[PDB]
RNA sequence: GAGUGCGACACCUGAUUCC
DNA sequence: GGAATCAGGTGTCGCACTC
């Protein structure tokens, strides 16, 4: 389920009441629950909005209208995966959302990839990339390790990667807003001068933004796909996160380390 | 030692909808 | 009994940064 902002929750509630919806007793941690005919809408205090009952089409459209009314388009959301994992690639993804893309993300109930299973992520990423334009920078470990040699700091590397993608996408698409996770204290500073006239937002919990969340899903799916390829390529079994790393280091032939791991890590 | 942000991974428990 | 959605919480492992 997607996450509504504070203003959207309030505007959605008013809108649904204004066309007759009946308030019902909300479940634990929910803000409100409305019935419209036989369709149920539940909005959690977190902002997550959940459809229930039957004939959910009218509810879905009303939510879409609400989110569309206060979301400036076109916009870009930016996110990375594989940053803190010793094994496998670093992936930076940016998604450009126009109206058709935004409506799609809403329909899909898109949210932060951290809250999604692997199968859900792969499924959603293909739905996303079928509708939205975007750009992905993939750094498999062999490439990552070379890039890291020049930067000697992951934030500096991330800055360079984001700066290039965002600059190119802004020149091409000229969005009204650019939103990105605060991945370093210097990220705003680096991105400020490549976004042209767009409003730039660098902030924590950036995945509350639909386009940022869509980007987290794409970046994560690219990582998962690459992890599988690395496994078949080097005939090795790999953990998606940081588990069993000391043993994995010993098990893995030394000449494959630069091809599988982020060597600068101390694990 | 304690935090913040980013990246995760692995679990527990409760609620809701539909069949 | 099955599919799914949400929420509150626990632990572990990394890079960067602050006190
Ligand atoms: Mg991410």
Contact of A212 with A200, CB cutoff 8 Å: no
Tell me: do A110 and A237 sit in the same domain. Answer: yes
**What's the token pair of residue A131?**
């509708």
Contact of A261 with A86, CB cutoff 8 Å: yes
Beta partners for A136? A93
CA angle A42, A45, A47 (to 5 degrees): 75
d(CA A212, CA A134) in angstroms, rounded, equals 11
Beta partners for A94? A78, A135
Tell me: do A116 and A218 sit in the same domain. Answer: yes
Tell me: do A136 and A167 sit in the same domain. Answer: yes
Q: Which nucleotides of C are covered by protein (CB under 7 A)?
A: 5-8, 12-17
Tell me: do A64 and A91 sit in the same domain. Answer: no
SS (H, E, C) chain A: CCECCHHHHHHHHHHHHHCCCEEECCCCCEEEEEEECCEEEEEECCCEEEEEECCCHHHHHHHHHHHHHCCCCCEEEEEEECCCCCECCEEEEEEEECHHHHHHHHHHCCCCHHHCCHHHHHHHHHHHHHHCEEEEEEECHHHHHHHHHHHCCHHHHHHHHHHHHHHHHHHHHCCCEEEEECCCCCHHHHHCCCCCCCEEEEECCHHHCHHHHHHHHHHHHHHHHHHHHHHHHCCCCCCCCCCCHHHHHHHCCHHHHHHHECCCCCC
Tell me: do A99 and A64 sit in the same domain. Answer: no
d(CA A220, CA A91) in angstroms, rounded, equals 7
Residue A150 zone, left/alpha/beta (φ > 0; ψ -120 to 50; rest)? alpha
Contact of A32 with A43, CB cutoff 8 Å: yes
d(CA A262, CA A44) in angstroms, rounded, equals 39
Q: Is the CB of A118 under 7 A from strand C?
A: no
Method of determination used here: X-ray
Tell me: do A37 and A156 sit in the same domain. Answer: no
Measured in angstroms, how far is the CA atom of residue A93 from the centroid of ligand 1? Answer: 9
- Structural domain containing residue A16: 1-72
Measured in angstroms, how far is the CA atom of residue A210 from the centroid of ligand 1? Answer: 13
- HSE on the CB side for A102, CA within 13 Å? 20
What does the CA dihedral A202, A205, A211, A216 come to, rounded to 10 degrees? 110
Tell me: do A12 and A104 sit in the same domain. Answer: no
d(CA A258, CA A267) in angstroms, rounded, equals 15
**CATH code of the domain in which A127 resides:** 3.30.420.10
Contact of A71 with A171, CB cutoff 8 Å: no
Which candidate, A126, A100, A91, A116, places its Cα nearest to that of A3? A116
Measured in angstroms, how far is the CA atom of residue A18 from the centroid of ligand 1? Answer: 38
Could you tell me the distance in Å between the CA of residue A123 and the C1' of nucleotide C2?
22
Measured in angstroms, how far is the CA atom of residue A192 from the centroid of ligand 1? Answer: 21
Tell me: do A63 and A41 sit in the same domain. Answer: yes
**CATH code of the domain in which A39 resides:** 3.30.310.10
What does the CA dihedral A208, A210, A212, A216 come to, rounded to 10 degrees? 100
How many structural domains comprise chain A?
2
d(CA A195, CA A188) in angstroms, rounded, equals 11
**What's the token pair of residue A214?**
């869509």
Last residue of a domain, one of A46, A72, A98: A72
Last residue of a domain, one of A54, A72, A90: A72
Tell me: do A167 and A238 sit in the same domain. Answer: yes
**What's the token pair of residue A80?**
């990375």
Tell me: do A60 and A79 sit in the same domain. Answer: no
Last residue of a domain, one of A47, A72, A97: A72
d(CA A161, CA A173) in angstroms, rounded, equals 18
Tell me: do A48 and A179 sit in the same domain. Answer: no
Instruction: Give the experimental resolution in Å.
Output: 2.1
d(CA A221, CA A116) in angstroms, rounded, equals 11
Tell me: do A42 and A133 sit in the same domain. Answer: no
Contact of A212 with A180, CB cutoff 8 Å: yes
């Amino acid at each position: 389920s997607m996450k509504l902002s504070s203003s959207e929750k309030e505007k959605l509630l008013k809108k649904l009441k204004a066309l007759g919806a009946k308030e019902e007793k909300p479940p634990e941690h929910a803000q409100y629950r409305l019935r419209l005919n036989d369709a149920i809408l539940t909005v959690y205090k977190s902002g997550s909005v959940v459809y229930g009952g039957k004939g959910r089409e009218k509810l879905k459209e009303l939510v879409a209208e609400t989110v569309l009314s206060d979301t400036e388009l076109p916009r870009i959301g930016c996110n990375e995966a594989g940053k803190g994992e010793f094994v496998g690639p670093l992936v930076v993804a940016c998604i450009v959302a126009d109206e058709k893309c935004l409506k799609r993300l809403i329909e899909l109930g898109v949210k932060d990839s951290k809250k999604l299973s692997n199968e859900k992520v792969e499924e959603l990423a293909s739905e996303i990339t079928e509708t939205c334009h975007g750009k992905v920078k993939l750094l498999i470990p062999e490439k990552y390790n070379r890039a890291y040699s020049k930067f000697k700091n992951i934030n500096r590397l991330l800055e360079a990667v984001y700066r290039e993608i965002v600059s190119d996408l802004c020149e091409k698409f000229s969005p009204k807003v650019v939103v990105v996770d605060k991945f370093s204290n210097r990220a705003e500073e680096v991105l400020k001068d490549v976004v042209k006239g767009a409003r730039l937002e660098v902030r924590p919990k950036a995945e509350d933004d639909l386009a940022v969340a869509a980007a987290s899903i794409v970046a994560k799916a690219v990582r998962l796909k690459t992890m599988k390829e690395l496994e078949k390529r080097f005939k090795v079994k790999l953990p998606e996160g940081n588990t069993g790393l000391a043993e994995l280091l010993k098990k893995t032939p030394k000449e494959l380390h630069e091809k599988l791991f982020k060597l600068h890590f101390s694990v």
